[PDB]
Amino acid sequence: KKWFSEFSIMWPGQAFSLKIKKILYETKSKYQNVLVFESTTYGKVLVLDGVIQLTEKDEFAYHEMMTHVPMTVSKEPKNVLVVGGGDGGIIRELCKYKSVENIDICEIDETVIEVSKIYFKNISCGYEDKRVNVFIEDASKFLENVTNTYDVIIVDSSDPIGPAETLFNQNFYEKIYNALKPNGYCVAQCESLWIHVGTIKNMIGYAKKLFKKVEYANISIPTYPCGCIGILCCSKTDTGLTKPNKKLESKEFADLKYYNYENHSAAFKLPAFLLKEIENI
Amino acid sequence: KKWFSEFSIMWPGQAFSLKIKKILYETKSKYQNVLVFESTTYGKVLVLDGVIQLTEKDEFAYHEMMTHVPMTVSKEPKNVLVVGGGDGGIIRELCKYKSVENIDICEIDETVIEVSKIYFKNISCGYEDKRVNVFIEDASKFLENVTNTYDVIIVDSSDPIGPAETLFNQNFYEKIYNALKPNGYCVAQCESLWIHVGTIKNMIGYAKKLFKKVEYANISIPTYPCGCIGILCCSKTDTGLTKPNKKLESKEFADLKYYNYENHSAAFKLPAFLLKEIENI
Numbered sequence A, B: 001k002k003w004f005s006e007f008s009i010m011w012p013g014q015a016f017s018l019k020i021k022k023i024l025y026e027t028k029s030k031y032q033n034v035l036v037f038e039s040t041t042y043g044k045v046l047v048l049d050g051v052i053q054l055t056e057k058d059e060f061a062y063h064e065m066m067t068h069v070p071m072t073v074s075k076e077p078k079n080v081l082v083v084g085g086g087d088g089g090i091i092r093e094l095c096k097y098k099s100v101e102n103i104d105i106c107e108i109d110e111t112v113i114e115v116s117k118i119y120f121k122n123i124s125c126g127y128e129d130k131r132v133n134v135f136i137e138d139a140s141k142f143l144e145n146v147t148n149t150y151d152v153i154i155v156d157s158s159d160p161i162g163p164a165e166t167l168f169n170q171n172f173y174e175k176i177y178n179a180l181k182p183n184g185y186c187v188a189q190c191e192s193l194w195i196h197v198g199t200i201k202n203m204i205g206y207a208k209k210l211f212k213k214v215e216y217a218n219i220s221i222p223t224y225p226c227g228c229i230g231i232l233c234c235s236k237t238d239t240g241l242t243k244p245n246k247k248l249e250s251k252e253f254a255d256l257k258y259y260n261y262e263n264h265s266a267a268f269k270l271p272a273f274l275l276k277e278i279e280n281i
C-alpha cells in the first residue's frame, strides 16, 4: 500500500503520514486539489491541496470544540454562520441546538460540499435540516454583503495557502465584527502553538483592534500538524468565552465525544511560553 | 537531505517524519539501537529503536509536566527516584528544588547517559549536581532491591517494545507502591489517548489494585505520536495529584516554558470519550 504524506512550506522539516487502504476520489476543483481516500486506521480522509482537512477518526474533537465553545456561551443563539466548513461537521454540531432558527454557511468550493455529501455521510447529514442555507461564494465577499447579523460566527477555514488566503488579515476581522450581534461571538481556527507563534500574535493583534476580549484555546487533534490546533476567540463583552453558560444535557448531545463542561474552560489553560509571547500584544 | 521517519507496530497506519540536517551518532548498545541526529527544525533528536525520545524543541513540555506535577503536590520531597530517563531531562527539572537531598536514577542503558552528556548538554546538565546518584540496571530489578523509600517516583521509560517491556505490568506497580513513602506519589508516562485506550485501561486497572487515587493527565508534545502523551498518576491518599500545593516562584523556576499552576489542573480535564472508557474500571 502506498502512504499519503502531508508536507508543507507552512511547517517545514516535519511531515505526518497515513497509510492508504484505497483512493476514493480526486479532482481539481475551481479552487483546490481535492483528494478523498480511505486510510487504514483513521477511516476516510479529506485532503485539500495536500493538507488534511479531516478524518473520520478524530474530526469530532475539532468540530465539537469549535461549535460548543461559542454555542454554550451564547445565551439564546438564533442565527449562526459557518465560514468555510464545506464538509458540514460544524453544521452537524449546530443542528443539535433546537433553539437555532437559521444556519447559514458560506463555502467557496461547492465540490467540497458535494464530495462530503457522497463520501462523508455521517459528517454531511446536517445539510438535510431545513434550517440550513448554503451560499457558494468567497466569505470575504459574503461578509461584505450580508444584511443579517449573527449571534455566532464560526470560521472553519482551510489554511492561508489557497482560497483561504483572504480570511487571515485585519480587514477580515472588521467584517466579522460588523456581521455579529452587539453581544455576538466569533471563533476561528488559528495556528498550532508549536509552529508559528508569530502568526498567533498577528491574529490576536487583529482581533484586539475590534473585540473587547480575545482569548486563545487549544484542541488536541492528531491529524493536524503538531497534533493540535488553536481557536481564536473573539467577544464584544468583557466576559469572553472560557466559561460555558449552559450544560448540554438534552438527548441530541448524548453522543458527544470530546466536548464537556470542564474541557471547555481547560482548553484555555495554555503553556507558559505561549502566555509570555502574547502578554504585551 | 534525507528524512527520519517514525514507523511502529505500536501505532500502525501512521508516521511522523523530521528532516535531517546531519546524523551525529549511531550505535547498537547492549539494549537498543541509538540514533542522534540534528533535525532541520526541531534541533537535536534522540532516537531509540526507531522511536523518538526527545528533541531539543519540545522536550521541556514533557520533562516539566512529568516532574512538576508530582513535585508541587509532594509537600517536602527529600528523596526522588527517576526510572529510565537516561537523557537527564527529569533530573534537570528536579535539581531546581533546593529542598531535594537526593536524586537516584535507575537507567538500564549507560550509553544513553553518555550520549546525552556529550550531545545534549542542556538536557544532561543535572548529572553535575552532587545530589544525583546513577544506577545502571534494569528498574525492574532495582525496585525489588532498593532499601530506601521515595517521596516521588517518576517512571520516564521508553515504550513496551525493548528493555522497557518489564515496566508495563501489575508486578511493576506493586514494586512502585512498596518503594514509595506512605504519602508518596508515582507518575508514569502512559499511552496517548488517541491510540490504545485499551492500554490506558489496563494500566489504570493495575494502579487501582494498589493506589487509593489513580488519575490520568495529558500533555501536548508534537514529536510523540498523535502529538500527545499521558501521565498515569498514582497517590496513596484520596486527595490525588490534580491540585498543586505550592507555586514555583523562586529564581530556579523563572525559566519554565510549559508548566504553570493552572496547566497543572487543566491537564487532568480529559475528552468525553476517554472518561467514558475509564469510568467502570
Ligand SMILES: CSC[C@H]1O[C@@H](n2cnc3c(N)ncnc32)[C@H](O)[C@@H]1O
Residues within 6 Å of the ligand: A031, A048, A053, A083, A084, A085, A086, A087, A106, A107, A108, A109, A112, A137, A138, A139, A140, A156, A157, A158, A162, A163, A164, A165, A166, A167
Ligand atoms: C473542509 S472545511 C474548510 C473549507 O474552507 C473553505 N474555504 C477556503 N477558503 C474559503 C473562503 N475564502 N470562503 C469560504 N470558504 C472557504 C474550503 O474550500 C474548505 O472546504
Ligand SMILES: CSC[C@H]1O[C@@H](n2cnc3c(N)ncnc32)[C@H](O)[C@@H]1O
Residues within 6 Å of the ligand: B031, B048, B053, B083, B084, B085, B086, B087, B106, B107, B108, B109, B112, B137, B138, B139, B140, B156, B157, B158, B162, B163, B164, B165, B166, B167
Ligand atoms: C531516553 S529516556 C527513557 C529511558 O528508559 C530507559 N529504560 C528502558 N527500559 C528500562 C528499564 N527496564 N530500566 C531502566 N531504564 C529503562 C531507556 O534505556 C531510555 O534511556
Ligand SMILES: NCCCN[C@H]1CC[C@H](N)CC1
Residues within 6 Å of the ligand: A051, A052, A053, A054, A085, A087, A089, A090, A156, A157, A158, A159, A189, A224, A225, A229
Ligand atoms: N472542517 C474540517 C476542516 C478544518 N479546517 C482546517 C484544515 C487544515 C488544518 N491544517 C487546520 C484546520
Ligand SMILES: NCCCN[C@H]1CC[C@H](N)CC1
Residues within 6 Å of the ligand: B051, B052, B053, B054, B085, B087, B089, B090, B156, B157, B158, B159, B189, B224, B225, B229
Ligand atoms: N526523557 C524523554 C524520553 C521519554 N520517554 C518516551 C519516549 C518514547 C515516546 N513514544 C513516549 C515517551
